[PDB]
């Protein structure tokens, strides 16, 4: 009772079976010639099925026998994968020998039930000025990184990685999704020289494989994160784990590719109508739970800097912060180079962050946005013709921008790789003083490339 190759067109495959013996959806189909594998997409009656090829699309012969597994796609999981890089099938692609474990789990579980949402919202700190002041995180949150091409975004993620690793036994995981493999290799080696791989797991989809593979890498990473969170350690509560999405947009595009060939009609942009279904399927399995939590970071690309179409629209209905990188702030020499005026979080709320921090954020928003709108007239005439009012405002804004300059903990070579991870409370103190004007008598340079008030004062005194 083995099926055969009956029709192949590009990325869509069909097989005949004996009508009594019919494979169920989402179960693997074994090419009897090669290692290539097929996933069920829909059952075409008469023992006819439609499938997508996991692996190469070569060597294919009409009328070649193929067998099944009668079971969904399961790959090994567990601590025997940390610091190893796997394919979409969980095989060693790092030539580091085979995986050590046999703990294999399927990849199409259901979203966690309603009753098991973490009954309370949480918060996460990063020790980073602009973020922990203006982009708060909930443990279990959803984070978007928009734009940024004159700076090392991967450097930023790796900084967060060192943040969480030193901050918690909670490990980390990244998934290659349409990965610009140059940057992927760079990240791999730089994490390598960081000597931090024990808390990291690697799967790559690198713009070279049938769309299904790049679709499913996301599920793979999801599954790894799930299981790893579920390992309740010595207490009954496992570690809270972190995820890295190479790009959500490529996840959308993976399904977008062959949707029409699937017989699916186009959507409002020509897209796949199952867009929202798969999107929610993805997101709803990323939450905080009664025991443990899982959060993720999503490297976001924006087409032509346009957000007013479904592809980012659907995503936005699932994130919790919109970190939008800034290019000319990098041109201003700022290390993080993150815009301080557009990035937001839904987490900016006095009830969750306290009142003082919230109101400080309010005031800094106001001062920065007011300074921006005076740029033109300042250029036209000069500082003098402005009233004495807002001169201190200009100085304070400039000092704020300097204060945001945070030397990186892990670049290994940008300023010596010095970590700051300053407490939120100390930064609150410093920005409170600056808003009050406690130090509105010092050149902004003293606030540059440093952290708390102690560093600023020491720098100002040394010079």
């Amino acid at each position: 009772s083995s099926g055969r190759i009956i029709q192949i067109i590009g990325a869509v495959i069909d097989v005949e079976f004996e009508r009594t013996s019919v494979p169920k959806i989402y179960d693997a189909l074994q090419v009897d010639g090669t290692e290539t594998t097929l996933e069920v997409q829909q059952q075409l009656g008469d023992g006819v099925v439609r499938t997508i090829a996991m692996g190469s699309t070569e060597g294919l012969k009409r009328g070649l026998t193929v067998t099944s597994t009668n079971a969904p796609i399961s790959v090994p999981v567990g601590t025997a994968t940390l610091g190893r890089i796997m394919d979409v099938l969980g095989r060693p692609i790092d030539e580091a020998g085979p995986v050590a474990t046999e703990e294999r789990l399927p990849i199409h579980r259901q979203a966690p039930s309603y009753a098991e949402q973490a009954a309370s919202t949480d918060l996460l700190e990063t020790g980073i000025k602009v973020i922990d002041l203006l982009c708060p995180f909930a443990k279990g949150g959803k984070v978007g990184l928009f734009g940024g091409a004159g700076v090392g975004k991967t450097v930023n993620m790796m900084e967060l990685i060192n943040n969480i690793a030193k901050a918690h036994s909670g490990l980390s995981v990244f998934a290659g999704v349409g990965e610009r493999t140059r940057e992927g290799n760079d990240f791999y080696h730089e994490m390598k020289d960081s000597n931090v791989l024990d808390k990291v797991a690697m799967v790559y989809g690198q713009m070279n494989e049938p769309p299904g593979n790049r679709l499913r890498v996301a599920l793979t990473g999801l599954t790894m994160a799930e299981y790893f969170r579920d390992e309740k350690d010595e207490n009954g509560k496992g570690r809270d784990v972190l995820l890295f999405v190479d790009n959500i947009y490529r996840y959308t595009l993976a399904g977008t590719e062959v949707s029409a060939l699937l017989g699916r009609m186009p959507s409002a942009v020509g897209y796949q109508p199952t867009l929202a279904e798969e999107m929610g399927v993805l997101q709803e399995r990323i939450t905080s739970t009664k025991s443990g939590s899982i959060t993720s970071i999503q490297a976001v690309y924006v087409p032509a800097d346009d957000l007013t179409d479904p592809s980012p629209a659907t995503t936005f209905a699932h994130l919790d912060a919109t970190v939008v990188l800034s290019r000319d702030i990098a041109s201003s020499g700022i290390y993080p180079a993150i815009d301080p005026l557009d990035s937001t979080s839904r987490q900016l709320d006095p009830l969750v962050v306290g009142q003082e921090h919230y109101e400080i954020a309010r005031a800094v928003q106001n001062v920065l946005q007011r300074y921006k709108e005076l740029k033109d007239i300042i250029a036209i005439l000069g500082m003098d013709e402005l009233a004495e009012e807002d001169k201190l405002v200009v100085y304070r804004a400039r000092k704020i921008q300097r204060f945001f300059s945070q030397p990186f903990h892990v670049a290994e070579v940008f300023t010596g790789a010095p970590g700051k991870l300053v407490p939120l409370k100390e930064t609150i103190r410093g920005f409170k003083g600056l808003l009050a004007g406690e130090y509105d008598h010092i050149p902004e340079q003293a606030f540059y490339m440093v952290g708390g008030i102690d560093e600023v004062i020491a720098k100002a005194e040394k010079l």
Binding site: Q7, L60, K61, R62, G63
Partner: protein
């Protein structure tokens, strides 16, 4: 009934010349031609991307694999 019908089919037509001896799987029949597009009858043995030779001596590219024909 069923098997008797099959045997009667083998009777009124013996083998049908083995259907021209499996119709020469190494032979492709020229069916439909329009604007450099070639439809072929038979030739079950096909790769996604075979080189396709012809009596004219030229070459075609194997792209579409169907249940009945071939798109080249």
């Amino acid at each position: 009934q069923l098997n008797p019908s099959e045997i009667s089919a083998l009777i009124k037509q013996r083998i049908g010349d083995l259907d021209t001896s499996a119709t020469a799987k190494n032979e492709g029949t020229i069916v439909m031609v329009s604007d450099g597009i070639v439809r072929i009858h038979g030739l079950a043995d096909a790769m996604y991307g075979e080189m396709i030779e012809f009596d004219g001596g030229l070459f075609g590219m194997a792209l579409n694999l169907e249940q009945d024909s071939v798109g080249a």
